[PDB]
Amino acid sequence: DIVMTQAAPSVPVTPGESVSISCRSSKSLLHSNGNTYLYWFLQRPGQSPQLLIYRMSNLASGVPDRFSGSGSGTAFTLRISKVEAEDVGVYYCMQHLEYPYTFGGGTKLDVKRADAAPTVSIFPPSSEQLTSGGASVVCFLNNFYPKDINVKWKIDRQNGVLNSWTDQDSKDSTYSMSSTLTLTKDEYERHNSYTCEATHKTSTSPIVKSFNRNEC
Amino acid sequence: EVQLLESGPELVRLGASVKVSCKASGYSFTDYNMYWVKQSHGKSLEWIGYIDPYNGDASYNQKFKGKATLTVDKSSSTAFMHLNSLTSEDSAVYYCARTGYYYGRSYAMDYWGQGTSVTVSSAKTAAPSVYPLAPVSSVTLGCLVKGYFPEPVTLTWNSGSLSSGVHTFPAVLQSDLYTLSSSVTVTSSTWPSQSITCNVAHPASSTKVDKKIEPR
């Protein structure tokens, strides 16, 4: 089998500048007919993969002029000049020369926008949920950058936390995380305060959003 | 515009089999080979095989030999993928994709279907319980879809009308059950002066419910 290798798992890039995604193959992809059977695909967040470049250097329909493909026999490069916010996603290489066809690991493209602080909102468990037992404390952290951020849960620091991240937004290049402290009705109603501490690069002290069980 | 429409999500018991379909339109179906690709939860891509809808001969990847079977229906312009004796490792998203051919040259996987998520589990379908997430310049509201199985679930707020300022987070497992979360941000003058609910639909359990965000 031909093994396709993309060394870089992610490349941080500020909008307007150029990027190069690398791909190496375990064997030459040069065919006797002159063509080179290397393929670039793009997968946008929440989308299906789309053909970007076919046979090393040919752009598929509608593919922006900003993209180009080159390479020798082993090393290949996807140059994305002047990156836009909608270029976010994972770029895969693929060989079409021999059976079976194989794909690279993929390189995630992340757009380096201006650092944005997280907007934090904490939410006590609903009345409908307490009626049927169990209490989920939901904490949203929306529109922030970079992606690196630590979320801490102080009650009176515990576990049972369920975290979820969105992909980088196509428009504003930001991230959003939803942290949920899943507890039982007996454990929830036993303690009082519940805080949502968030530590980010854009922060003096961490951002804190809290409430107490019997205040409102 | 070339359209590939795939079968909906499927929940399959261990050892059982599934048959996913890919209906083509916008071109002559029998003119081009239909490729099939497996994408795992780690978003890695593998080529499964392809089928020539005309003569019906199909080449397969060695790894998927004996597990995948490709067929075609010319009367409904549809390609099919059968997967037998399913295990947990078969739980993934499966794509079909056309491969162009013009004047002696090929265009591999130039257009892809939306994909078909397959879940292999002994668990039974559990209906979600939705809970309005009311708060304790701009106010954020929330909607918690907890304890459903399997994927997926659709979520809108004002029957799809309120789309901007919405962050619907990817589902995450917790003891073999999915939890979904979404947050909407609007100006403080809009809520609670204007009503806003949460439309959640879980087709596998045939459950569609609405929960108006009520002040505490």
Author numbering:
A (entry chain L): 1 to 30, 30A, 30B, 30C, 30D, 30E, 31 to 151, 155 to 214
B (entry chain H): 1 to 52, 52A, 53 to 82, 82A, 82B, 82C, 83 to 100, 100A, ...
Quote the passages of the study that discuss this structure, keeping the authors' original sentences.
The final Ab64 structure contains H chain residues 1–213 (except for residues 128–133), L chain residues 1–214 (except for residues 152–154), 34 waters, and one sulfate. The Ab64 antigen-binding site is a shallow groove, 24–32 Å long and 9–19 Å wide, walled by H2, H3 and L1, and the floor formed by L3, H1 and part of H2. The sulfate ion is located near H-R100a and H-Y100c from the HCDR3 loop, and L-Y49, L-R50 and L-N53 from the LCDR2 loop, away from the putative antigen-binding site, so is unlikely to mimic an interaction of FtGroEL with the antibody. The Ab64 antigen-binding site is made up of mostly polar, uncharged residues, including seven tyrosine residues, four of which (L-Y94, L-Y96, H-Y35 and H-Y50) are clustered near H-W47. The FtGroEL contacts include 6 polar residues, a finding that was expected given the polar nature of the Ab64 antigen binding-site. In the docked model, K344 contacts the antibody via the lysine side-chain, which sits in a pocket formed by antibody residues H-D52, H-N54, and H-D56. The mutational analysis showed that substituting a glutamate at the K344 position of FtGroEL abolishes binding of Ab64 to FtGroEL. This observation is consistent with the Ab64-FtGroEL docked model since the glutamate would not be expected to make favorable interactions in this negatively-charged pocket. However, whereas all 12 Ab64 contact residues are outer-surface-exposed in both the non-GroES-bound heptamer and the GroES-bound heptamer, only 4 of 9 Ab53 contact residues are outer-surface-exposed in the GroES-bound heptamer, making it unlikely that Ab53 can bind to the GroES-bound heptamer. The likely interaction of Ab64, but not of Ab53, with the GroES-bound ring, especially in bivalent IgG form, may prevent, induce, or stabilize a conformational change in FtGroEL, which may account for the protective effect of Ab64 but not Ab53 in the mouse model of respiratory SchuS4 infection.
